[PDB]
RNA sequence: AUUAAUAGGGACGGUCGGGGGCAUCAGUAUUCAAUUGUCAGAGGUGAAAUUCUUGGAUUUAUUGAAGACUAACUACUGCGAAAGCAUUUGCCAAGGACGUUUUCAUUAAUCAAGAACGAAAAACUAUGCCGACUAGGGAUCGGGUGGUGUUUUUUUAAUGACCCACUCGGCACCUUACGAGGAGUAUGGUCGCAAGGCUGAAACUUAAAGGAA
């Protein structure tokens, strides 16, 4: 993990396959593999210390276009998951907000116009739900009811 | 160690002058199969000395040959089965074999194994009337009806244990009621597994039913009259 | 003459019924006839009277093996080529603790699939982890490497060690018991009794 | 409740609403009563008395047909047990398992099941002793119950 | 001389399971050996070496023993208190669920302490708001009830499979309703470090040998 280059090659394992269908080394790499993987490294290094909106702003796509893209994409993700789940193949796991990343998204570069996941649903889920206005401030509410301590019965007797 | 870089080992120190010409000294014997089969003629086999008539006879008594039931039985589908024939008599450029065992073939077993259904395996040890001791292995996979909608058809283990006991009963009553030619003629056209299917259709309908393997374990004292009878002694010609 | 048959499940039945025409035109380029049974759920390859590659009957057998193991059709015909063999690796019998076993399998696939994909690139193979069998395809030396790394992953060596090792190798190649239990402590009530 | 285990089952016999006789029953209370004491002289536990009388002779419940429950009919006839039937069956279970262990010294699961059964035996005996249907010095012990069965 | 809790026991009934115990039976491989062939190499690897081989290894054939394990079937699963459990046929007990117009009548729920059971080179990118909580939805395993036709068979033995409607109870998944420091730089301080006269060769301009040229 403290190594700097094995783990980099693990991270851009997918782009290299995608755009060279070896030359993992960053001084024989050529073409759109070189371009995209540089965009990768710069985003990671800046992500640890920049602010969330400016480190990943999305390009502008009108509404029906972007909704259409995400819909078609999610059907492709679920086809993949169904085919593996049937003919039982393990799949790497994803934090259940995020879109699973597959070889079609690495090729189409659809992450720049879709995003990691639907940010509105992310934020709205990660809020905590709002409690009521609270009233009876003398005892503890249990499954059985208000337990009212002897000391408090004394203090307001 | 062929090449020029390859160093000597203890290896090529004392060699042997190959002079003997083994495939001059050898001799060819024709073999032949019992009378329960169609294409009786098969095979020629070598004997490592000719100059032992009795020594040659000892080698050919020892032998075990095995052959595809297709070419043994006319039907040119290589019917995925093997007959081991054992040679236990000699007479004059003819070996008079006898039945020794049987097996399916691993590609046929892969050809039947399937995922959403269980297999049933019975393996009964029996005795024929000729005092041979047999071990017969029989296999059967459960099936879905001509009607179902559930996606998989598994047998509850009551049904499995009643099927295994039923298969055991049919096998042991049929082979104890056989003699060894009577067995072989039963085994050739696959009539046992119709008996199994017809007697197990009342439990949980099986599809794919077979007599997988037969292992011989015991033979009696050898029986020349019986064997030459099963196949079905001679003047010389007066060298002067 | 010779023929080999295998069986597939119904999801592959729909997929196969699409791709089948490319199979018969590829195998007839090699002169091998084939047939698909939706009635029983099988696939059969036969040689014909005009074929003459006795190895191709074994390779095409293995083609239908892969397609019913749900490897898609482009990777099937890569089995049909000459310097490629498939391989099934068993991983059922390496540990008992099932939690531990599932963790080790997922260690082989790894975050986003990275370790599997990086072995795929460094060994030119095509790996498919299923259940208890890791089915790979590739050139034979690739299969040597895969068997070593998957086996020691199911034993306790991290595949990331074997990936580092492969990368460097390639660079240099360029250069008392009782059964009766004790008594029971009595309750306060029964003590009062 | 459901201790010792993992199931939350509800599978009981539900008693019909009305506490009157069925409209088709035609026998007589003393006939049922003499039948019960006949079965007791045969030597059957009240559970079995009821299930015979439901199956064969067509009685719903003793308290429905006759005026009283079974074992008070028994006590009216001097047919009481020593120790009540659920305790008795429990003790039989525990000592039988104990014999099995003594045979098969390497049964961890049977050791565990013995511990659970005796736990029930202690609880039940405590309640029975509490209401005083058993003598207050009634002690379930290994050889005591073993010779009770022997 | 109460009711019989969608509280608890307990009995009975037909089952269900890769739960446990002792015993048995089988499977190919592997290791060892006997016997048989044929002839010079085998094994292993980035490449090799150690190693085994003309008292014949590897290889082929017939058999024998030996210890382990229980393939493919093997999951959208099953059983177990947890650790865990996988070929057969017995035997010994135990168990959940379901069925029940049986039986007892609050016998109870959670638990600090305490007791039973608990292989142990390991671990290494996972992560889900929860809650005493409302409706559901698809498949799944176990039992039960009705309907219904196909598979089935008919006086001697099993009268089991599938489809559908419900219905209890399970391991699950998909939806819903309400609710309580981090990163970096600077540093006339303290401690620790730290340099080079071509070497030999220093009291000696000091030979032979090198290192550079």
Do the beta carbons of residue D69 and residue D76 sit within 8 Å? no
Contact flag C4-B107 (C-beta cutoff 8 Å): yes
A157 to A134, A135, A137, B19: CA distances (angstroms): 24, 21, 16, 124
User: What does the alpha-carbon distance between residue C53 and residue C47 come to, in Å, rounded to a whole number?
Assistant: 9
For the packed helices C159-174 and C114-123, what is the interaxial angle rounded to 10 degrees? 30
Quick one: chain A helix, strand, coil %, rounded to 5? 50, 5, 45
Reduced to 3 states, what is the DSSP secondary structure of residue A147?
strand
Residue C188 neighbours by CB distance under 10 Å: 7
Chains A and D touch (3+ CB pairs under 8 A): no
Given A11, A24, A93, which is nearest C114 (Cβ)?
A11
Do the beta carbons of residue C66 and residue C75 sit within 8 Å? yes
How big is chain D by its Cα radius of gyration, in Å? 19
Three-class secondary structure assignment of chain C: CCEEEEECCHHHHHHHHHHHHHHHHHHHHCCCEEEEECCCCEEEEECCCCCCCHHHHHHHHHHHHHHHCCCCHHHHHHHHCCCCEEEEEECCCCCCCHHHHHHHHHHHHCHHHHHHHHHHHHHCCEEEEECCEEEEEECHHHHHHHHHHHHHHHCCCCHHHHHHHHHHHHHHHHCCCCCCCCCCCCCHHHHHC
Chain C touched by A6 (CB under 8 Å): yes
Edge-to-edge strands, sheet with C133-138:
C85-90, C133-138, C126-130
Contact flag C181-D111 (C-beta cutoff 8 Å): yes
Q: What sign has the CA pseudo-torsion C150, C154, C155, C156?
A: positive
Question: Chain C: nearest CA to B227, how far in angstroms?
Answer: 34
Residue A143 neighbours by CB distance under 10 Å: 4
D31 to D43, D58, D65: CA distances (angstroms): 19, 12, 11
Provide the token pair at A74: 């999610």
Provide the token pair at B153: 């058809």
The two beta strands, C85-90 and C133-138, are antiparallel
A67 to A58, A103, A117, C65: CA distances (angstroms): 14, 21, 12, 41
User: What does the alpha-carbon distance between residue D109 and residue C30 come to, in Å, rounded to a whole number?
Assistant: 63
For the packed helices A13-20 and C114-123, what is the interaxial angle rounded to 10 degrees? 50
Do the beta carbons of residue C162 and residue C151 sit within 8 Å? no
Reduced to 3 states, what is the DSSP secondary structure of residue D89?
helix
Residue B239 lies in a domain: no
Q: Of chain A residues 59-98, which have a CB less than 8 A from chain C?
A: 83, 86-93
User: What does the alpha-carbon distance between residue B96 and residue A39 come to, in Å, rounded to a whole number?
Assistant: 81
Do the beta carbons of residue B119 and residue B140 sit within 8 Å? yes
Question: Chain C: nearest CA to A6, how far in angstroms?
Answer: 7
Residue B4 lies in a domain: no
Do the beta carbons of residue A16 and residue A23 sit within 8 Å? yes
Tally of CA atoms within 13 A in the half-sphere of B190 that contains its CB: 13
Do the beta carbons of residue C164 and residue C146 sit within 8 Å? no
Provide the token pair at B50: 């000719």
Residue C149's nearest CA partner among C192, C184, C104, C189 is C104
Provide the token pair at A4: 């700097």
Residue B17 lies in a domain: no
Reduced to 3 states, what is the DSSP secondary structure of residue A37?
helix
Give A4 CA → E182 C1' in Å.
21
State which approach was used to obtain the coordinates. Answer: cryo-EM
Chain D touched by C187 (CB under 8 Å): yes
Edge-to-edge strands, sheet with C42-46:
C3-7, C42-46, C33-37
Three-class secondary structure assignment of chain B: CCCCCCCCCCCCCCCCCCCCCHHHHCEEEEEECCCCCCCCEEEEEEECCCCCHHHHHHHHHHCEEEEEHHHHCCCCCCCCCEEEEEEEEECCCEEEEEEEEEECCHHHHHHHCCCCECEEEEEEEEECCCCCEEEEEEEEEECCCCCCCCCCECCCHHHHHHHHHHHHHHHHHHHHCCCHHHHHHHHCCCCHHHHHHHHHCCCCCEEEEEEEEEEEEECCCCCHHHHHHHHCCCCCCCCC
Chain C touched by B154 (CB under 8 Å): no
For the packed helices C140-154 and C114-123, what is the interaxial angle rounded to 10 degrees? 150
D17 to B24, B151, B193, D20, D64: CA distances (angstroms): 105, 45, 59, 9, 11
Beta bridge partners of C86: C137
Q: Which residues contact A70 (CB under 8 A, 6 or more apart)?
A: A114, A118
A78 phi-psi bin (left φ>0, alpha ψ -120 to 50, beta other)? alpha
Residue B1 lies in a domain: no
Q: Which residues contact A56 (CB under 8 A, 6 or more apart)?
A: A43, A47, A115, A116
Do the beta carbons of residue C41 and residue C10 sit within 8 Å? yes
Scanning the structure block, which residue is given the tokens 């049919």? B170
User: What does the alpha-carbon distance between residue B170 and residue B164 come to, in Å, rounded to a whole number?
Assistant: 10
> For chain B, how many residues are written?
240
Do the beta carbons of residue C72 and residue C39 sit within 8 Å? no
Residue B12 lies in a domain: no
Reduced to 3 states, what is the DSSP secondary structure of residue A146?
strand
User: What does the alpha-carbon distance between residue A15 and residue A11 come to, in Å, rounded to a whole number?
Assistant: 9
User: What does the alpha-carbon distance between residue C34 and residue C38 come to, in Å, rounded to a whole number?
Assistant: 13
**Which backbone phi and psi does B136 adopt, to 5 degrees?**
-110, 130
* H-helix or E-strand spanning residue A19: helix A13-20
Residue B28 lies in a domain: yes
Contact flag C6-B111 (C-beta cutoff 8 Å): yes
Strand E bases with any atom < 7 A from protein Cβ: 1, 3-12, 15-22, 25-28, 36-41, 46, 49, 51-54, 56, 61-63, 69-76, 80-85, 87-90, 92-110, 113-119, 121-130, 132, 139-143, 149-153, 158-164, 168-171, 179-180, 182-183
Beta bridge partners of B82: B68, B103
Residue C145's nearest CA partner among C132, C158, C136, C156 is C136
Provide the token pair at C45: 């390859």
Scanning the structure block, which residue is given the tokens 């009157």? D20
Task: Report CA C91 to chain centroid distance, whole Å.
Answer: 10
Beta bridge partners of B99: B85
Do the beta carbons of residue B104 and residue B213 sit within 8 Å? yes
The string of DSSP letters for D8-22 reads: -----PPPPS--S--
Residue B3 lies in a domain: no
User: What does the alpha-carbon distance between residue C23 and residue C34 come to, in Å, rounded to a whole number?
Assistant: 8
Task: Report CA C139 to chain centroid distance, whole Å.
Answer: 15
For the packed helices C140-154 and C98-109, what is the interaxial angle rounded to 10 degrees? 140
Q: Which residues contact B227 (CB under 8 A, 6 or more apart)?
A: B88, B89, B96, B98
Resolution (A): 3.9
Domain residues for B49?
24-232
List, by residue range, all CATH 1.10.287.10 domains of chain D.
81-150
Specify the CATH number of the domain D81-150.
1.10.287.10
Do the beta carbons of residue B68 and residue B84 sit within 8 Å? no
Considering only CB atoms, which chain C residues are within 8 Å of B107?
4
Scanning the structure block, which residue is given the tokens 């008693």? D15
User: What does the alpha-carbon distance between residue B149 and residue D122 come to, in Å, rounded to a whole number?
Assistant: 52
Residue B230's nearest CA partner among B42, B36, B32, B64 is B36
Considering only CB atoms, which chain C residues are within 8 Å of B116?
9
Contact flag D101-C179 (C-beta cutoff 8 Å): yes
Residue A14, burial from CB neighbour count under 10 angstroms (0-12, 13-18, 19+): buried
Reduced to 3 states, what is the DSSP secondary structure of residue D56?
coil
Contact flag C112-A14 (C-beta cutoff 8 Å): yes
Given C11, C111, C118, which is nearest A87 (Cβ)?
C11
User: What does the alpha-carbon distance between residue B49 and residue B56 come to, in Å, rounded to a whole number?
Assistant: 6
The two beta strands, B119-127 and C133-138, are unpaired
Scanning the structure block, which residue is given the tokens 């980099």? A8
* H-helix or E-strand spanning residue D86: helix D85-103
The two beta strands, B94-103 and B27-32, are parallel
Scanning the structure block, which residue is given the tokens 């991270």? A11
Give A90 CA → E170 C1' in Å.
27
Given B111, B115, B151, which is nearest C5 (Cβ)?
B111
């Amino acid at each position: 993990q403290n190594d700097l280059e094995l783990q980099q090659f693990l991270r851009e394992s997918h782009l290299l396959s995608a755009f060279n269908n070896i030359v993992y080394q960053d001084d024989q790499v050529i073409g759109k593999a070189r371009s995209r993987t540089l965009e990768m490294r710069l985003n990671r290094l800046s992500r640890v210390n920049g602010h969330q909106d400016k480190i990943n702003k999305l390009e502008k796509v009108p509404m029906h276009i972007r909704r259409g893209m995400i819909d078609k994409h999610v059907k492709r993700i679920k086809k993949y998951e169904q085919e593996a789940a049937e003919g039982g193949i393990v799949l790497s796991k994803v934090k259940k907000g995020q879109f699973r990343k597959i070889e079609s998204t690495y090729k189409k570069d659809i992450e720049r116009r879709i995003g990691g996941s639907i940010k509105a649903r992310d934020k709205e889920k990660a809020t905590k739900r709002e409690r009521g206005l609270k009233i009876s401030s003398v005892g503890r509410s249990t499954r059985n009811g208000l337990i009212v301590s002897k000391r408090d019965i004394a203090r307001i007797s | 160690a062929v090449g020029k870089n390859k160093r000597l080992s203890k290896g090529k120190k004392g060699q042997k002058k190959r002079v003997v010409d083994p495939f001059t000294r050898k001799e060819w014997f024709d073999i032949k199969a019992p009378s329960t089969f169609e294409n009786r003629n098969v095979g020629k086999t070598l004997v490592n000395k000719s100059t032992g008539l009795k020594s040659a006879s000892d080698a050919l008594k020892g032998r075990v040959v095995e052959v595809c039931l297709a070419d043994l039985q006319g039907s040119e589908d290589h019917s995925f089965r093997k007959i081991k024939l054992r040679v236990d008599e000699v007479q004059g450029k003819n070996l008079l074999t006898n039945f020794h065992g049987m097996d399916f073939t691993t590609d046929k077993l892969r050809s039947m194994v399937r995922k959403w259904q269980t297999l049933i395996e019975a393996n009964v040890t029996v005795k024929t009337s000729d005092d041979y001791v047999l071990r017969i292995f029989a296999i059967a996979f459960t099936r879905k009806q001509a009607n179902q909608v559930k996606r998989h058809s598994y047998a509850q283990s009551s049904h499995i244990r009643a099927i295994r006991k039923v298969i055991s009963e049919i096998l042991t009553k049929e082979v104890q009621g056989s003699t060894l030619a009577q067995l072989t003629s039963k085994l050739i056209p696959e009539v046992i597994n119709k008996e199994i299917e017809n007697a197990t259709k009342d439990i949980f309908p099986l599809q794919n039913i077979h007599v997988r393997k037969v292992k011989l374990l015991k033979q009696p004292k050898f029986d020349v009259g019986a064997l030459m009878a099963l196949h079905g002694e001679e003047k010389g010609k007066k060298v002067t | 003459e010779s023929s080999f048959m295998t069986l597939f499940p119904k999801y592959r039945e729909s997929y196969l019924k699409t791709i089948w025409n490319d199979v018969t035109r590829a195998l007839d380029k090699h002169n091998i006839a084939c047939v698909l049974d939706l009635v029983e759920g099988s696939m059969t390859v036969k040689t014909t009277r005009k074929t003459y590659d006795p190895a191709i009957i074994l390779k095409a057998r293995d083609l239908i093996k892969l397609l019913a193991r749900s490897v898609p059709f482009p990777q099937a015909v890569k089995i049909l080529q000459d310097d490629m063999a498939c391989d099934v690796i068993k991983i059922g019998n390496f540990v008992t603790n099932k939690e531990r076993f599932v963790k080790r399998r997922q260690r082989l696939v790894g975050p986003n699939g990275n370790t599997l994909k990086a072995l795929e690139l460094l060994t030119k193979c095509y790996i498919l982890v299923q259940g208890n069998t890791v089915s790979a395809m590739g050139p034979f030396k690739g299969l040597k490497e895969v068997r070593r790394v998957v086996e020691d992953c199911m034993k306790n060596i991290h595949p990331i060690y074997h990936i580092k090792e492969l990368m460097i190798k390639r660079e240099l190649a360029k250069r008392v018991y009782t059964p009766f239990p004790p008594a029971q402590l009595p309750r306060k009530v029964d003590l009062e009794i | 409740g459901r201790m010792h285990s993992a199931g939350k089952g509800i599978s009981s016999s539900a008693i019909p609403y009305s506490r009157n006789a069925p409209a088709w029953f035609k026998l007589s209370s003393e006939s049922v009563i003499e039948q019960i004491v006949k079965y007791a002289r045969k030597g059957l536990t009240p559970s079995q008395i009821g299930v015979l009388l439901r199956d064969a002779h067509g009685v719903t419940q003793a308290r429905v047909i006759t005026g009283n429950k079974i074992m008070r009919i028994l006590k009216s006839n001097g047919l009481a047990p020593e120790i009540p039937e659920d305790l008795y069956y429990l003790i039989k279970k525990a000592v039988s398992v104990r014999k099995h262990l003594e045979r098969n010294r390497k049964d961890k699961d049977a050791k565990f099941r013995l511990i659970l059964i005796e736990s029930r035996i202690h609880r039940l005996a405590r309640y029975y002793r509490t209401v005083a249907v058993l003598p207050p010095n009634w002690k379930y012990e290994s050889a005591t119950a073993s010779a009770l069965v022997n």
